[PDB]
Design a protein around this nucleic acid. Sequence first.
RNA 1: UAUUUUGUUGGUUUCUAGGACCAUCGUAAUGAUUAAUAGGGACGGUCGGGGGCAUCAGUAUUCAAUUGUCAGAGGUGAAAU
Length: 127
Amino acid sequence: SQVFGVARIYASFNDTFVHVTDLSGKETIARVTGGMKVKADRDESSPYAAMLAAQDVAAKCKEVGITAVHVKIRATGGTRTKTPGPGGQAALRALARSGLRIGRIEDVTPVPSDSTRKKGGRRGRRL
RNA sequence: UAUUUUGUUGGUUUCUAGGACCAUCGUAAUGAUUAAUAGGGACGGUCGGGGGCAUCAGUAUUCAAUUGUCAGAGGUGAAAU
Ligand SMILES: [Mg+2]
Ligand SMILES: [Mg+2]
């Protein structure tokens, strides 16, 4: 049968993390980010650097033995936006298209039961 | 109270001066307005994120301990700290 890992795509703004672990989550198999793949440090959040991160993560899942993966897409959460950034779906498309098999897609963004006053003041972040 | 009379005031003075019995020989329809689409109170089943005290839970955040992994991570319009 297939051997499953967990993809654990933290797609924030300003960066994307593709982090395959084992089924327990305690062993890391190729955490690769977008700033490892682009040198402009605004394109870390871009769909392009997510694609190059996810394809090399998929290229290290093979030679280790991971053939299929559960994905855990994940925005910043907490007091932040709760909206996954521009590279989550690009990382998902690349990791699905680069030889791995996918099952059990879920979103795991950390949501409070309202807690911990948001950063920015009362008038907000005014530009 | 006698005002009029008996021995000038004077006690008892008189079927005539009281609230005490009511004593014309004890009568009356005997005597308390509603119940405000005012108010207050009570009662009934309720209703509510009304209040106080105690208690319970939830993730999130921050930090810590253990763990795995390896060059970036944060952050922005772009940066830099
Ligand atoms: Mg602020
Ligand atoms: Mg404006």
